[PDB]
């Protein structure tokens, strides 16, 4: 059913063109990404996830750059920031128009204000050397929620250190959470460190097929993310 209150937002940033159920910004100037370091894009963008929903923020490029896929919580009242990492050992440049920045809604449930995800504790110690990708197997099934699919997203704090999580479905036999260290340090994550977050997405948001108003970039190679069809409505007073 069509049950999305507007997404209220305010936007101001002369280095990004607002193009825009999905808001998209394009870069106007070249963005240089240092290697081995986190690159951050300040968006000038404020946005209220409407009732029942969270927001998903992600960068899309065909350059050798990986975006953190951001979960925006209903309680978040600040300016949105995009987190990028460089796949290469030298500077990578994003020429104008090469980077699109998307924001769109999704319905979520919370199992038995108020964050979307539940942070997940690492069951083992994990070391990651510069540029290594490794996975952590999670075995114990989370509680089933009718009409929703458990999915793993990364956290921004770890993303800022250069550790990205590939978003993925937590399928009924367990999950392999892939982490990539984009930094110049060996990172040691201690057992019980909260290393990602579990989000129960409404099943409508995951599709194995090329549907309208969906995107193959976000959740992996075998799904597309299909967002809630909501209307963005500019409320400048949100800025701050
Ligand atoms: O790419 C992103 C991701 C998140 N956020 C904002 C919205 C979100 O509600 C908040 C916290 O993000 P996250 O939950 O990923 O951070 P954390 O490391 O889990 O910190 P916290 O414990 O405060 O949630 O930061 C962004 O601006 N950009
Ligand atoms: Mg969080």
Domain of 175?
Answer: 110-202
CB–CB of 79/44 below 8 Å?
yes
Distance CA 25, CA 27 (A): 7
**Ligand 1 lining (C-beta closer than 6 Å):** 57, 68, 70-73, 76, 80-83, 155-157
The answer to the question of whether 8 is labelled as a binding residue is no
Ligand 1: residue of 43, 114, 156, 198 to mutate (most ligand atoms within 8 A of CB) is: 156
Same domain, 104 and 140: no
Distance CA 21, CA 35 (A): 34
Q: How many CB atoms lie within 10 A of CB 197?
A: 18
Distance CA 9, CA 14 (A): 16
**Whose CA is closest to atom 12 on ligand 1?**
156
Same domain, 87 and 118: no
Same domain, 99 and 217: yes
Distance CA 4, CA 123 (A): 37
DSSP the chain: ------EEEEE--TTEEE---EEEEEESS-EEE-TTS-EEEEEEEEEEPPTTEEEEEEEE-SSSEEE--EEEPTT--S-EEEEEEESSSS-EEE-TTS-EEEEEEEEEE------S-EEEE-SS-EEE-TT-EEEEEE-SPPPP-TTEEEEEE--HHHHHTTEEEPPEE--TT-EEEEEEE-SSS-EEE-TT-EEEEEEEEEGGGEESS--TTEESSSS-SS-EEE-----EEE-GGG--
Same domain, 86 and 175: no
Q: Choose among 98, 200, 82: nearest CA to 149.
A: 200
**From which experimental method does this structure derive?**
X-ray
Distance CA 70, CA 52 (A): 17
The answer to the question of whether 54 is labelled as a binding residue is no
Resolution in units of Å: 2.0
Determine how β-strand 168-169 pairs with β-strand 126-128: unpaired
- CATH number of the domain to which 48 belongs: 2.70.40.10
């Amino acid at each position: 059913m069509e049950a999305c209150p507007h997404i209220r937002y305010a936007f101001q940033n002369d280095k990004l063109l607002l193009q825009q159920g999905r808001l998209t910004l394009v870069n106007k100037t070249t963005i240089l990404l240092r290697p081995m370091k986190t690159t951050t894009v300040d968006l000038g963008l404020y946005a209220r996830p409407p009732e029942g929903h969270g927001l998903m923020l992600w960068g899309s490029t065909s350059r050798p750059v990986t975006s953190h896929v951001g979960i925006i919580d209903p309680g978040y009242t600040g300016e949105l920031r995009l987190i990028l990492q460089n796949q290469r050992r030298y500077n990578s440049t994003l020429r104008p128009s090469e980077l699109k920045i998307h924001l769109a809604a999704f319905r979520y449930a919370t199992p038995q204000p108020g964050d979307v995800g539940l942070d997940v504790s690492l069951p083992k110690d994990l070391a990651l050397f510069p540029h290594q990708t490794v996975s952590v197997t999670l075995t114990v099934p989370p509680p089933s929620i009718p009409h929703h699919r458990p999915t793993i997203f990364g956290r921004s704090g770890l993303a800022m250190q250069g550790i990205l999580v590939k978003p993925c479905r937590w399928r009924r036999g367990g999950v392999d959470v892939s982490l990539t260290n984009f930094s110049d340090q060996t990172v040691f994550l201690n057992k019980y460190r909260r290393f990602c977050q579990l989000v129960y997405l409404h099943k409508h948001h995951l599709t194995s097929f090329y549907s309208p108003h969906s995107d193959a970039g976000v959740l992996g190679p075998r799904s597309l993310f299909r967002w809630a069809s909501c209307t963005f409505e500019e409320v400048p007073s949100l800025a701050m």
